[PDB]
Design an enzyme around this catalytic site. Structure first.
Site, PDB file in Angstrom:
ATOM      1  CG  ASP A  10     -13.215   5.828  -2.955  1.00 23.56           C
ATOM      2  OD1 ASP A  10     -12.740   4.937  -3.733  1.00 23.56           O
ATOM      3  OD2 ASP A  10     -12.542   6.685  -2.343  1.00 23.56           O
ATOM      4  CG  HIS A 121       7.016  -3.859  -4.850  1.00 31.03           C
ATOM      5  ND1 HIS A 121       7.289  -3.521  -3.551  1.00 31.03           N
ATOM      6  CD2 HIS A 121       5.873  -4.570  -4.831  1.00 31.03           C
ATOM      7  CE1 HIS A 121       6.326  -3.967  -2.774  1.00 31.03           C
ATOM      8  NE2 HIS A 121       5.469  -4.642  -3.523  1.00 31.03           N
ATOM      9  NE  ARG A 151       2.674 -11.107  -3.085  1.00 35.83           N
ATOM     10  CZ  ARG A 151       1.761 -11.201  -2.127  1.00 35.83           C
ATOM     11  NH1 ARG A 151       0.619 -10.534  -2.199  1.00 35.83           N
ATOM     12  NH2 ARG A 151       2.009 -11.992  -1.083  1.00 35.83           N
ATOM     13  CG  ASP A 152       3.452  -6.923  -7.983  1.00 33.70           C
ATOM     14  OD1 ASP A 152       4.592  -6.567  -7.519  1.00 33.70           O
ATOM     15  OD2 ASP A 152       2.429  -6.988  -7.287  1.00 33.70           O
ATOM     16  NE  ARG A 183       6.666  -9.998  -4.881  1.00 30.43           N
ATOM     17  CZ  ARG A 183       5.876  -8.941  -4.824  1.00 30.43           C
ATOM     18  NH1 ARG A 183       5.460  -8.282  -3.760  1.00 30.43           N
ATOM     19  NH2 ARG A 183       5.609  -8.470  -6.016  1.00 30.43           N
ATOM     20  NE  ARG A 189       3.406  -6.428   3.194  1.00 28.70           N
ATOM     21  CZ  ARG A 189       2.499  -6.167   2.262  1.00 28.70           C
ATOM     22  NH1 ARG A 189       2.671  -5.298   1.246  1.00 28.70           N
ATOM     23  NH2 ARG A 189       1.364  -6.838   2.317  1.00 28.70           N
ATOM     24  NE  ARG A 255       4.216  -1.549  -1.790  1.00 28.16           N
ATOM     25  CZ  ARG A 255       3.003  -2.064  -1.826  1.00 28.16           C
ATOM     26  NH1 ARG A 255       2.191  -1.887  -2.865  1.00 28.16           N
ATOM     27  NH2 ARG A 255       2.569  -2.754  -0.800  1.00 28.16           N
ATOM     28  N   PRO A 256       8.658   1.531  -0.832  1.00 30.66           N
ATOM     29  CG  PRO A 256       8.586   3.517   0.360  1.00 30.66           C
ATOM     30  CD  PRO A 256       7.900   2.790  -0.758  1.00 30.66           C
ATOM     31  CG  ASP A 257       5.536  -2.317   1.284  1.00 26.99           C
ATOM     32  OD1 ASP A 257       6.022  -2.334   0.116  1.00 26.99           O
ATOM     33  OD2 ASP A 257       4.413  -2.823   1.497  1.00 26.99           O
ATOM     34  NE  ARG A 258       5.499  -7.450  -0.586  1.00 27.42           N
ATOM     35  CZ  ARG A 258       5.243  -8.349   0.353  1.00 27.42           C
ATOM     36  NH1 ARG A 258       6.217  -8.921   1.063  1.00 27.42           N
ATOM     37  NH2 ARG A 258       3.992  -8.714   0.560  1.00 27.42           N
ATOM     38  CE  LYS A 328     -12.196   4.078  -0.381  1.00 29.29           C
ATOM     39  NZ  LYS A 328     -11.070   3.427  -1.106  1.00 29.29           N
ATOM     40  CG  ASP A 395     -13.039   1.635  -3.979  1.00 31.94           C
ATOM     41  OD1 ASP A 395     -12.098   1.522  -3.158  1.00 31.94           O
ATOM     42  OD2 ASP A 395     -12.909   1.319  -5.179  1.00 31.94           O
ATOM     43  CG  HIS A 399     -12.354  -3.353  -3.635  1.00 31.67           C
ATOM     44  ND1 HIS A 399     -11.579  -3.456  -4.770  1.00 31.67           N
ATOM     45  CD2 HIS A 399     -12.106  -2.136  -3.124  1.00 31.67           C
ATOM     46  CE1 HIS A 399     -10.895  -2.343  -4.937  1.00 31.67           C
ATOM     47  NE2 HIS A 399     -11.205  -1.525  -3.953  1.00 31.67           N
ATOM     48  CG  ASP A 436     -11.545   7.839  -5.471  1.00 31.45           C
ATOM     49  OD1 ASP A 436     -12.643   7.252  -5.772  1.00 31.45           O
ATOM     50  OD2 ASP A 436     -10.699   7.297  -4.712  1.00 31.45           O
ATOM     51  CG  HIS A 437     -10.637   5.039  -8.285  1.00 24.43           C
ATOM     52  ND1 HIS A 437     -11.336   3.866  -8.050  1.00 24.43           N
ATOM     53  CD2 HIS A 437     -10.299   5.543  -7.069  1.00 24.43           C
ATOM     54  CE1 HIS A 437     -11.350   3.639  -6.745  1.00 24.43           C
ATOM     55  NE2 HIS A 437     -10.755   4.651  -6.122  1.00 24.43           N
ATOM     56  CG  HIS A 454      -9.722   0.625  -8.114  1.00 24.90           C
ATOM     57  ND1 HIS A 454      -8.626   1.281  -7.608  1.00 24.90           N
ATOM     58  CD2 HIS A 454     -10.514   0.307  -7.044  1.00 24.90           C
ATOM     59  CE1 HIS A 454      -8.734   1.343  -6.285  1.00 24.90           C
ATOM     60  NE2 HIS A 454      -9.867   0.773  -5.919  1.00 24.90           N
TER      61      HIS A 454
HETATM   62  O1  2PG Z   1       2.015  -7.325  -1.319  1.00 29.77           O
HETATM   63  C1  2PG Z   1       2.463  -6.369  -1.998  1.00 29.77           C
HETATM   64  O2  2PG Z   1       3.639  -5.979  -1.948  1.00 29.77           O
HETATM   65  C2  2PG Z   1       1.535  -5.791  -2.980  1.00 29.77           C
HETATM   66  C3  2PG Z   1       1.695  -6.698  -4.197  1.00 29.77           C
HETATM   67  O3  2PG Z   1       3.018  -6.552  -4.756  1.00 29.77           O
HETATM   68  O4  2PG Z   1       0.164  -5.854  -2.580  1.00 29.77           O
HETATM   69  P1  2PG Z   1      -0.421  -4.632  -1.710  1.00 29.77           P
HETATM   70  O5  2PG Z   1      -0.315  -3.408  -2.574  1.00 29.77           O
HETATM   71  O6  2PG Z   1      -1.798  -5.128  -1.501  1.00 29.77           O
HETATM   72  O7  2PG Z   1       0.404  -4.630  -0.491  1.00 29.77           O
HETATM   73 MN    MN Z   2     -11.061   5.436  -4.239  1.00 33.81          MN
HETATM   74 MN    MN Z   3     -10.414   0.487  -3.800  1.00 36.56          MN
END
Ligand code: 2PG
Ligand code: MN
Ligand code: MN
Length: 503
Positions: A10, A121, A151-152, A183, A189, A255-258, A328, A395, A399, A436-437, A454
């Site tokens: 990885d 997002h 943030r992004d 945001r 979230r 993107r769902p989570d937020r 992984k 990987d 990081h 994989d990258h 990455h």
């Molecule tokens: O916090 C999040 O929403 C994203 C940054 O927009 O970070 P991560 O992909 O690490 O959750």
């Molecule tokens: Mn990877």
């Molecule tokens: Mn990684």
């Protein structure tokens, strides 16, 4: 039984510079021995080749999805970009129904989303396409509810996106900003409903500060030391008439989570995070499905992936192992199987626990030796046709942005790779060694600071079969076709990648 294995190192790619390049600075006698003896090429694991935008570095989730699928798997941003480019977007049934709801009620269209080009997002150009569609369909009242990023993208960049959107409203003769929220408030979230309630209250024209323009409220925030992410929700004077019965909402976040939480406030009947009177006859559309408790129309529905490598193995009465340490393990299971948790017939799995440290520079070998010994034990059973193995270390250590630990990580992996691949060759089998990258190929900026991301670098491929020549480039979606080639199994039509072995 002759095994064929895919071995994923990885976050391990090809990069010309040796500066900060743990791949090149590591001693990897096994990898080099296989590389110098066996057929070799390099393949792309970033951008358009793996269903991402041009210039976007690959990742584990996207990587392992493309790998298992044997085709390019388009991720949401690129999918939506292309829908706009070719025109399908303007014909989408869900967006046209939302608009037909507004037109028939003479009510209002609201648009929610993260207003930046962060691309994690949302993308604000998707808002501009919604504005063009609304205008094409004659909708009269469009209210935009801006959620600010920081943030992004750069931490104070909201003014630029706001300005360009204001000029869009003018150019089209439609739309206006109705509320503006960081945001932090609109895209929490962690069930911090108190933060969400502030954004809700500004969106609905209930209770919030007001300013004459979006710029003005943002500048005021900046003046108090509060950057984009944390802008306190506010209403734009004379440009917000509330969310009322018969209105529609289109949330362009993909993107769902937020996005889920705000969407439950409006369209989960069961919502109780705080007291609400929900809007009646509200047509609520989300760009993707954020969760199962939101009553929404889904603009871009999930596409199930048929005939991933695991399913093809099953259907040829093959047996297979997926194996990796914790970091992984979802990649070699769920993502490898096209976003499916259930095991295929004949599939068995091995999870090895990763060390519990905060950062893996503290144990560069991670659990790589335990992974290798588990794999040896499985191979000695003699009943495996296919193996999908990931060594997490390059990987997960890379990081850290620390060069010596990342080198030590690659070195431990190389010792394991020797033992694994020699056993496979011992069994008259075949290994594809690859990644994989990238990541570990660059752990230092050119001025010697930690780099923790990455890369967009192409990845090596080694195929341990003699007398064969590999194609000179390719993509991750070509790996599974190469495995089927090695196994002499027929490749179905919906796997559109192509074997790396020339015929
Ligand atoms: O916090 C999040 O929403 C994203 C940054 O927009 O970070 P991560 O992909 O690490 O959750
Ligand atoms: Mn990877
Ligand atoms: Mn990684």
């Amino acid at each position: 039984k002759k095994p064929t294995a895919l071995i994923i190192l990885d976050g391990f790619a090809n990069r010309e510079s040796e500066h900060g390049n743990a791949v090149k600075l590591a001693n990897k006698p096994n990898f080099d021995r296989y590389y110098n003896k066996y057929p070799t090429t390099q393949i792309e694991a970033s951008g358009l080749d793996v269903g991402l935008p041009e210039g976007q570095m690959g990742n584990s989730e996207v990587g392992h999805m493309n790998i298992g699928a044997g085709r390019i798997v388009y991720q949401s941003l690129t999918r939506i970009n292309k829908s706009i480019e070719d025109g399908d977007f303007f014909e989408n049934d869900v967006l046209n129904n939302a608009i037909a709801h507004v037109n028939s009620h003479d009510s209002a269209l609201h648009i929610f989303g993260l207003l930046s080009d962060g691309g994690v997002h949302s993308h604000y150009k998707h808002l501009f396409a919604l504005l063009e569609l609304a205008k094409k369909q004659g909708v009269e009242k469009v209210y935009v509810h801006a959620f600010l990023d920081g943030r992004d993208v750069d931490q104070k960049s909201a003014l630029k996106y706001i300005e360009e959107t204001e000029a869009k409203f003018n150019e089209l003769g439609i739309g206006q900003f109705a509320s503006v929220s960081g945001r932090y408030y609109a895209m929490d979230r962690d069930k911090r409903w108190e933060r969400e309630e502030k954004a809700y209250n500004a969106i609905r024209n209930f209770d919030a500060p007001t300013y004459a323009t979006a710029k003005e409220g943002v500048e005021a925030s900046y003046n108090e030391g509060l950057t984009d992410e944390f802008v306190v929700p506010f209403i734009v004077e004379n440009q917000n008439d509330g969310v009322n019965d018969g209105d529609a909402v289109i949330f362009y976040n993909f993107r769902p989570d937020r996005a889920a939480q705000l969407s439950e406030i409006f369209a989960n009947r069961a919502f109780e995070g705080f007291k609400v009177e929900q809007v009646k006859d509200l047509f609520y559309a989300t760009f993707t499905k954020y969760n199962d408790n939101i009553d929404a129309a889904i603009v871009f529905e999930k596409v199930d992936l048929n005939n991933t490598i695991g399913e093809i193995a099953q259907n040829n009465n093959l047996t297979q192992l997926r194996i990796a340490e914790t970091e992984k393990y979802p990649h070699v299971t769920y993502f490898m199987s096209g976003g499916r948790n259930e095991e295929f017939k004949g599939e068995r799995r091995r999870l090895i626990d990763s060390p519990k440290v905060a950062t893996y520079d503290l144990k560069p070998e991670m659990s790589a030796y335990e992974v290798k010994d588990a794999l040896l034990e499985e191979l000695n059973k003699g009943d495996l046709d296919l193996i999908i193995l990931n060594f997490a270390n390059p990987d997960m250590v890379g990081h850290s942005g620390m060069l010596e630990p990342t080198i030590k990580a690659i070195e431990a992996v190389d010792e394991c790779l020797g033992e694994v691949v020699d056993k496979i060759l011992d069994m008259d089998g075949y290994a594809i060694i690859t990644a994989d990258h990238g990541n570990s190929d660059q752990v230092l900026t050119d001025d010697d600071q930690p780099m923790t991301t990455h890369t967009t670098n192409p990845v090596p491929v080694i195929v341990t079969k003699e007398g064969v020549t590999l194609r000179e480039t390719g993509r991750l979606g070509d790996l599974a076709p190469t495995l089927l080639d090695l196994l002499n199994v027929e490749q179905p039509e919906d796997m559109t990648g192509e074997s790396l072995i020339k015929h």
